[PDB]
């Protein structure tokens, strides 16, 4: 096998992939790794069997740096996973991890601002950010959408966001929504005195239309926009990220259509690779998990991709799914956004798991507070601040979250109607 070189030592500039592959019976693992690998040739340098699985192996592939176009996530995905999931010799194939060498990382702009620049621009420190998804999902007029945005933001929420499928429809054209949301953002800012924002959806049919929506957001002076990178495409995302860096706009990224590629354990691309591709292409926030009942998915896997998308240097940790040491050479980090049913008594768990550098999203639209949207937002803000204060005092949140919530509720009438 010219393409299986177990004695090869990967270079400091090689792009490395870790494939979890299940070959068809009768096909030796070395032959299957050689096929995936097949001066500019990709080579399989390491194959390890998965202990506790049926005929499953991890194949490590090394690609020369000259194979890829500088600063192009599109080309990287075309080269690595263009036509390899269609090999008949493989029953199942799953890309688990990528190693982006610093030499390649330096060719990317990365996220427009990052976590620290975001915190400095918004003047919010020492706590997680809070967001809500305006509900109902669709049918609402731009005026009523703006009213809901203002009501939720004035309560104490830092962000609101358009629904993932809200781009521009007969019921609510995009420019009307942008104008009414801008009025709501400014009203809530004047009322509370804190900087507010709303994830305006710029996702559109053509790059020209998407840039026009970003331009309108820039002309209104609003802080942040939103994009669907897995449906819009890396090419559209990279254009939007370059624009946002040029014009000082924050960029929230929603991972629509992700489960179509990262759900099945045997086939597809693991979300961590999609998260690294997003960080390379550019995004200040990246919807990274759902909290149905509780944070779903293995905690270690979540922590692994959160560290991969946040930290500057992540050492190899197979326990958390890190197959390679990832040096980001000072590329700005991406803030993970945990969305879903974030109930008030579940805030301590998520604050403990994520820390301060994350945005908790109430994608359920809240509305569970009997008093209204604004008091519900206040209750959430009070709960988050109380949990953060308790954690800063040395309390163990996983053991005293209920006590902290009760103690905060003892003095908060808004949280009292929420804790019931």
């Amino acid at each position: 096998l010219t393409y299986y070189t177990p004695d090869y030592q990967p270079k400091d500039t090689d792009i490395l992939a870790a494939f979890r592959m299940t070959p068809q019976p009768g096909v030796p693992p070395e032959e299957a790794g050689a096929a995936v690998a097949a001066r500019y040739k990709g080579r399989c340098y390491d194959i390890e069997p998965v202990p506790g699985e049926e005929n499953q192996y991890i194949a490590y592939i090394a690609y020369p740096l000259d194979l890829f176009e500088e600063g192009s996530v599109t080309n990287l995905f075309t080269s690595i996973v263009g036509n390899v999931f269609g090999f008949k010799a493989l029953r199942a194939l799953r890309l688990e991890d990528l190693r982006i060498p610093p030499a390649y990382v330096k060719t990317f702009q990365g996220p427009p601002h990052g976590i620290q620049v975001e915190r400095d621009k918004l003047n919010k420190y020492g706590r997680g950010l809070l967001g809500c998804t305006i509900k109902p999902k669709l049918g609402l007029s731009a005026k009523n959408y703006g009213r809901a945005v203002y009501e939720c933001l004035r309560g104490g929420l830092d962000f609101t966001k358009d629904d993932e499928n809200v781009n521009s429809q007969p019921f609510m054209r995009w420019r009307d929504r942008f104008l009414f949301v801008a009025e709501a953002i400014y009203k809530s800012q004047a009322e509370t005195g804190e900087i507010k924002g709303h994830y305006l959806n710029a996702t559109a049919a053509t790059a020209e239309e998407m840039l026009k929506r970003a331009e309108c957001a820039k002309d209104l002076g609003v802080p942040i926009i939103m994009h669907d990178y897995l449906t819009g495409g890396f090419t559209a995302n990279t254009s939007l990220a370059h624009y946002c860096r040029d014009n000082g706009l924050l960029l929230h990224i929603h991972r629509a259509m992700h489960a179509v590629i990262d759900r099945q354990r045997n086939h597809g691309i693991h979300f961590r690779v999609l998260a690294k591709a997003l960080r390379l292409s550019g995004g200040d926030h990246l919807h990274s998990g759902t909290v149905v009942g509780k944070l779903e998915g293995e905690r270690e896997v979540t922590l692994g991709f959160v560290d991969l998308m946040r930290d500057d240097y992540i050492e190899k940790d197979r326990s958390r799914g890190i197959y390679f040491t990832q040096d980001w050479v000072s590329l700005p980090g991406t803030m993970p956004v945990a969305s879903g049913g974030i109930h008030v008594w579940h805030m301590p768990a998520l604050v403990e798991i994520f820390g301060d550098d994350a945005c908790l999203q109430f994608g359920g639209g809240t509305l569970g507070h009997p008093w209204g949207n604004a008091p519900g937002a206040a209750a959430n803000r009070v709960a988050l601040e109380a949990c953060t204060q308790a954690r800063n005092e040395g309390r163990d949140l996983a053991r005293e979250g209920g006590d902290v919530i009760r103690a905060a509720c003892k003095w908060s009438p808004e949280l009292a109607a929420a804790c019931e």
């Binding site: 177990p6 194959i47 069997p49 998965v50 202990p51 192996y57």
Partner: peptide, 16 residues
């Protein structure tokens, strides 16, 4: 973890 005879056989080849 448990490795199947094939996986273990491969290990022996990788050792050789």
């Amino acid at each position: 973890g448990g490795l199947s005879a094939e996986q273990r056989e491969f290990l022996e080849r990788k050792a050789r």
